[PDB]
Amino acid sequence: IESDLERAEERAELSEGKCAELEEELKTVTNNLKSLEAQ
Amino acid sequence: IESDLERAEERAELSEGKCAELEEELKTVTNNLKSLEAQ
């Protein structure tokens, strides 16, 4: 169960980092879309 | 350790669910941006 918990924490950290990066990417993409939609 | 694994799996699977929703949101907004920029 300890061996289970360590890899569970590792994948959780990886997923959280990926989610944060994708949230930043979403913010940038929607900012560019809003800027381009003016024309 | 069992309790730790339980709530770890809980918020982990919540994280991948949110990540998948964010992935599809990025895909659709990118498609919309490409469609607008095509013309």
Which amino acid appears at position B25 of this protein? E
Q: How far is CA B3 from CA A8, B6, B7, B10, B11, in A?
A: 13, 5, 6, 11, 13
Task: Please state how this structure was obtained.
Answer: cryo-EM
> For tokens 């929703």, what's the residue?
B21
Distance from CA of B9 to the nearest CA of A (A): 7
Per CB distance under 8 Å, which residues of B are interface residues toward A?
1-2, 4-5, 8-9, 11-12, 15-16, 18-19, 22-23, 25-26, 29-30, 32-33, 36-37
Q: At what resolution in Å was this solved?
A: 3.3
Q: Which helix H or strand E contains A7, and what residues bound it?
A: helix A2-36
